[PDB]
Amino acid sequence: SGFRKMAFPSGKVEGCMVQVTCGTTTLNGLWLDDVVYCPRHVICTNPNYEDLLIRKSNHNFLVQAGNVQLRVIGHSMQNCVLKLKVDTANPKTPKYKFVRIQPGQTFSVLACYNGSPSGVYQCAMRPNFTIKGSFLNGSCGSVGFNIDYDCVSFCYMHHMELPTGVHAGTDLEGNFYGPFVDRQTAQAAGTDTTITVNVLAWLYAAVINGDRWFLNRFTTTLNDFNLVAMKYNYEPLTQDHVDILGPLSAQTGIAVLDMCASLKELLQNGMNGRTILGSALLEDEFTPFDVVRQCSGVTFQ
Amino acid sequence: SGFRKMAFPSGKVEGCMVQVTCGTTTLNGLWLDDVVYCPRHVICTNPNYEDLLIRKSNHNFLVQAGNVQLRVIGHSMQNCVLKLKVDTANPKTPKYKFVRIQPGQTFSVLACYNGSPSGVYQCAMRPNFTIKGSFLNGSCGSVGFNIDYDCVSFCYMHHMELPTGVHAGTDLEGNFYGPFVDRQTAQAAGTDTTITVNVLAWLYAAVINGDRWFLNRFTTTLNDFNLVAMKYNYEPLTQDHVDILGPLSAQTGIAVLDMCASLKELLQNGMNGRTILGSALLEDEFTPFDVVRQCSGVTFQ
Numbered sequence: 001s002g003f004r005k006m007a008f009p010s011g012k013v014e015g016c017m018v019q020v021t022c023g024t025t026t027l028n029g030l031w032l033d034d035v036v037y038c039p040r041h042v043i044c045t046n047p048n049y050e051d052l053l054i055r056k057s058n059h060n061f062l063v064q065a066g067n068v069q070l071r072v073i074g075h076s077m078q079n080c081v082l083k084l085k086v087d088t089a090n091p092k093t094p095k096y097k098f099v100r101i102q103p104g105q106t107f108s109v110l111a112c113y114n115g116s117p118s119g120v121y122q123c124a125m126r127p128n129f130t131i132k133g134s135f136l137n138g139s140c141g142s143v144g145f146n147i148d149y150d151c152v153s154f155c156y157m158h159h160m161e162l163p164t165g166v167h168a169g170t171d172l173e174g175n176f177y178g179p180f181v182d183r184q185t186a187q188a189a190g191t192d193t194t195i196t197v198n199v200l201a202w203l204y205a206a207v208i209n210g211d212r213w214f215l216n217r218f219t220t221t222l223n224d225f226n227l228v229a230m231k232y233n234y235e236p237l238t239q240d241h242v243d244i245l246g247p248l249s250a251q252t253g254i255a256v257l258d259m260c261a262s263l264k265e266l267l268q269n270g271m272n273g274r275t276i277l278g279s280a281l282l283e284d285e286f287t288p289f290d291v292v293r294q295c296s297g298v299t300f301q
Numbered sequence: 302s303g304f305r306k307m308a309f310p311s312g313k314v315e316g317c318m319v320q321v322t323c324g325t326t327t328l329n330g331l332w333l334d335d336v337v338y339c340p341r342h343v344i345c346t347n348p349n350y351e352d353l354l355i356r357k358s359n360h361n362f363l364v365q366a367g368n369v370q371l372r373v374i375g376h377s378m379q380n381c382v383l384k385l386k387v388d389t390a391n392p393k394t395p396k397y398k399f400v401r402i403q404p405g406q407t408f409s410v411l412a413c414y415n416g417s418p419s420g421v422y423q424c425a426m427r428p429n430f431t432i433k434g435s436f437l438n439g440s441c442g443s444v445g446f447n448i449d450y451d452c453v454s455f456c457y458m459h460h461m462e463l464p465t466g467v468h469a470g471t472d473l474e475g476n477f478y479g480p481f482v483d484r485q486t487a488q489a490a491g492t493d494t495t496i497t498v499n500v501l502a503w504l505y506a507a508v509i510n511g512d513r514w515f516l517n518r519f520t521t522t523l524n525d526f527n528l529v530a531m532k533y534n535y536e537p538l539t540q541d542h543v544d545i546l547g548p549l550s551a552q553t554g555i556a557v558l559d560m561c562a563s564l565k566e567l568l569q570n571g572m573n574g575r576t577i578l579g580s581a582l583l584e585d586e587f588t589p590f591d592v593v594r595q596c597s598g599v600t601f602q
């Protein structure tokens with residue numbers, strides 16, 4: 001019992017983190033096989049990164065793997081990431097993949113400074129393609145990831161903080177999530193919405209854990225719910241979302257559209273001082289998979 | 302910027318987790334040097350664990366270190382933990398200590414099943430010596446820990462779930478936190494309180510992060526605050542607590558007793574639909590150290 005916002009164990013990723021210093025910029029890099037990936041804004045000196053990178057030399061890049069130097073034997077840029085070719089393959093390279101996630105999906109973040117891990121936490125890709133992380137100067141190059149059995153799917157590399165305190169970054173192929181650029185220009189996040197399928201998943205987690213007070217006799221149609229969703233700045237719920245909530249609906253014996261009726265009432269009436277799973281707000285950064293994973297006990301290695 | 306409930310990187314602990322099977326009980330163990338620590342209720346068959354342990358043989362204990370067998374060459378019981386002497390020292394043993402924490406202190410939990418890590422999350426030792434964890438059948442033997450630079454301080458080993466869905470366990474010397482026993486007798490948690498110094502720390506985190514709406518002109522004395530604390534089932538605030546909040550008070554320029562006045566108003570008036578750091582409740586599982594750590598970026602290795 002219990003429900004916590006739970007990150008993946010970070011060991012496999014910790015073994016990949018290195019420090020990349022170039023000029024007076026230090027940030028983190030990800031060392032997989034004989035390549036170190038890091039944000040291209042580590043490059044010296046509106047910037048024109050192809051200009052800037054040709055002025056570079058391999059010896060300009062100081063890569064720190066713990067206390068061991070890594071000799072850079074080549075470099076290239078891939079969209080907004082730099083790939084530093086090094087002469088030693090990381091002996092701790094896990095089985096891995098580069099995946100791009102969808103808004104509403106969750107991942108763990110290993111926050112790092114100077115190539116050293118500070119902490120691990122979970123978050124979601126918001127509908128507006130930002131993440132609500134916890135990142136200070138020097139955190140660039142920290143990565144986000146999911147683990148499936150033994151394989152690390154890297155999905156995020158951190159690049160910048162936007163002026164609402166939210167964060168933006170790229171996939172590991174260097175392509176930004178959202179309409180952001182690695183320029184210290186005026187950029188704004190854009191209007192966010194609540195991830196409806198996740199809120200419903202979390203309501204199922206609450207039921208599995210004994211919070212039942214928000215349940216009701218009522219029911220509703222998918223269209224009548226989506227009419228209320230739009231009013232409260234919730235994302236529309238699709239038949240695919242109803243399908244993915246299926247297993248949770250089966251386990252609890254509450255039909256998806258019934259749990260939607262509960263959410264409608266919660267949206268129109270509030271919680272009246274009650275809490276759900278220790279929260280006084282409707283939580284939307286747990287996916288249906290996160291809930292099943294946590295309430296069935298799937299492990300990794 | 303940002304504030305997340307952040308766990309320590311779990312790598313150093315992941316390398317210590319093993320599976321201990323004995324009869325039809327499987328749970329987790331902690332493998333440090335040539336000893337495996339696990340809950341003594343793994344023992345066969347109101348139980349009398351000294352009786353039960355003498356009936357035992359070394360070969361009764363199946364210790365799984367990944368896919369490698371560990372031969373048990375001796376066993377002894379230390380309070381409510383078993384120490385299984387094995388013939389191989391764990392080559393991945395970190396620098397470590399066994400520490401007992403105080404109510405109000407926080408730690409990371411590496412939740413494990415069958416010796417394999419499932420996830421990592423942060424929590425606090427409640428004033429009533431329970432923790433609000435996330436634990437399913439098979440999680441016993443999972444540990445809680447803090448990391449200071451390179452040294453892992455183990456503080457918790459998981460043993461049981463109480464009938465409110467909260468969790469109880471021991472330090473690594475086998476001594477329970479709180480008045481609990483490793484007996485499937487009727488046991489109840491006992492009345493909990495809110496950890497006041499932590500709530501104030503979290504309010505300082507909010508100010509550091511730009512939430513300022515709850516701040517006020519007012520002030521108050523330590524005794525007049527503690528009179529309001531007692532009314533709302535908050536722990537009393539001591540001059541020592543005021544002292545530890547000192548650094549946060551300095552950084553923000555808000556005197557501790559002023560932030561107490563803010564908390565009084567929040568207690569008497571509620572939040573009126575506002576949120577603080579993404580919460581509609583007053584959060585009390587961040588210590589002053591957790592806040593400083595996260596808003597200054599301390600790392601580990």
Ligand SMILES: *[C@H](O)[C@H](C[C@@H]1CCNC1=O)NC(=O)[C@H](CC1CC1)NC(=O)[C@@H](NC(=O)OCc1ccccc1)C(C)(C)C
Binds near residue numbers: 139140161302
């Ligand atoms: C890399 O270590 C840091 C991490 C960053 C610093 C504080 N929190 C963080 O996550 N990243 C950077 O320093 C960025 C480098 C730029 C991309 C090449 N810069 C920023 O994050 C930057 N934000 C920014 O310039 O974009 C928003 C903006 C700019 C101007 C006007 C309005 C909005 C800041 C200002 C945070 C350093």
Ligand SMILES: *[C@H](O)[C@H](C[C@@H]1CCNC1=O)NC(=O)[C@H](CC1CC1)NC(=O)[C@@H](NC(=O)OCc1ccccc1)C(C)(C)C
Binds near residue numbers: 438460487488
């Ligand atoms: C070890 O893997 C499990 C972990 C436990 C199961 C579900 N969530 C958990 O954290 N621990 C046990 O199975 C415990 C072993 C007992 C200590 C020797 N048992 C329990 O946790 C047990 N709880 C319990 O017996 O105490 C509370 C109680 C008992 C009777 C009447 C009122 C209250 C349960 C019932 C959860 C298995």
